[PDB]
Amino acid sequence: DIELTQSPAVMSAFPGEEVTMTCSASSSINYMHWYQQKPGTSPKRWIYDTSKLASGVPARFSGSGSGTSYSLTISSMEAEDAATYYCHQRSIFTFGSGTKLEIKRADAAPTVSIFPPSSEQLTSGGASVVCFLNNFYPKDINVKWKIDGSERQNGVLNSWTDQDSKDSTYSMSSTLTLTKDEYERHNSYTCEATHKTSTSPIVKSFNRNEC
């Protein structure tokens, strides 16, 4: 069969830059289509028949290519252009895996806060310690948990938001889930964020034996 690969998987750019992404076919085909998708909504026809713009698509966009190689190009990119773009063609079962275009902005350190397990959760026999890292840039950030002075790595789950549609920052939660008995065996809980904005981490902590 014929299969599609897209490059790059993820890219980011400031508004005003030129953007190019590529779609490659394992064997020659023609009349490539491109679909735009944003979080929570359906794919949308964007370019079709290799180079025709769909209705509502600005002339900053163009498609081109032939044979085994195709591309979508954006001049003077705008914030609303941020999306995942997928290629597809009439003899292809699986769409290309998509290029996710993200918005570059000024670096920002996270606002960090930590929360002890609630008494209601303890009553049921679980204990989640929740740490929020809000409104930071870029997306790459490292979170480290220390329990009574020693690094802890099991039972941590992290979840990032999509890039924020108004200020282009990212937020993320880091949650340490323990049993109530495991939580009750230790006292000092620390959440540390290490981000490229500073060589020294941002630290929030609490002692279980307070409050």
Binding site: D1, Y31, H33, Y35, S42, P43, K44, R45, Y48, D49, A54, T84, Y86, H88, R90, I92, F93, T94, F95, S97, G98, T111, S113, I114, F115, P116, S118, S119, E120, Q121, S124, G126, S128, V130, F132, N134, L157, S159, W160, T161, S171, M172, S173, T175, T177, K204, S205, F206, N207, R208, E210, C211
Partner: protein, 221 residues
């Protein structure tokens, strides 16, 4: 004008069956070839089935293996997909689409209907208030939260003060934990306003018909 509106998706045990429908409006439905496209949890898009305008020409995607049947009723402006012997790998959002010309771009898409194939059962969430407690903050702002734990299937919808606190809110994508979903939501308000002004998270889980409010109250230390 043109509308494509899917339905019939839901939770189904492995080996089970389901029928999806797509209601069409605003165009001469019988002049157009139609398709089903699905998007997997990994965001991968797969062409499932295609039907010609007359219903006499049909194609299926590679991994379907005869378990899918596309059909249409041009009199009722409805497209169908019958799915049987369902597998874990059939979990996806299923989209109704319309074709433009004979290079087969898809010029209109429906809103999608979600199909989830597993043995897990519908389960309501536990909701817990996140007050600073022994981690009390000291800025001009304070951040509070709600922990939503142990529900199935997705989604839940989280609001703060019935939607009147909308800025300063981050609701994080849910993750599987012991094969049930968990998420947290944070809200940030001026520290002069809490606790003098109440802050409450509103959690709705439609699949279980559950709705709960958790007031964020300072902990009794």
């Amino acid at each position: 004008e043109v509308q494509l509106v899917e339905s019939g998706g839901g939770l189904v045990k492995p080996g089970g069956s389901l029928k999806l429908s797509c209601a069409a409006s605003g165009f001469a439905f019988g002049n157009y070839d139609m398709s089903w496209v699905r998007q997997t949890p990994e965001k991968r898009l797969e062409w499932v089935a295609f039907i010609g305008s007359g219903g006499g020409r049909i194609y299926y995607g590679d991994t379907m293996k005869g378990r899918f049947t596309i059909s249409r009723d041009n009199a009722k402006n409805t497209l169908y997909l019958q799915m049987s012997s369902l597998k874990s790998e059939d979990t996806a959002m299923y989209y109704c689409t319309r074709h433009y010309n004979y290079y087969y771009s898809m010029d209109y898409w429906g809103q999608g209907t979600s199909v989830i194939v597993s043995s897990a059962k519908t389960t309501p969430p536990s909701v817990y208030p996140l007050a600073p407690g022994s981690a009390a903050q000291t800025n001009s702002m304070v951040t509070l939260g709600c922990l939503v734990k142990g529900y199935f299937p997705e989604p839940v919808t989280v609001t703060w003060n019935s939607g009147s606190l909308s800025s300063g809110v981050h609701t994080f994508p849910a993750v599987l934990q012991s094969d049930l979903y968990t998420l947290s939501s944070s809200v940030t308000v001026p520290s002069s306003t809490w606790p003098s002004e109440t802050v409450t998270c509103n959690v709705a889980h439609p699949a279980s018909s559950t709705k709960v409010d958790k007031k964020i109250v300072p902990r009794d230390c």
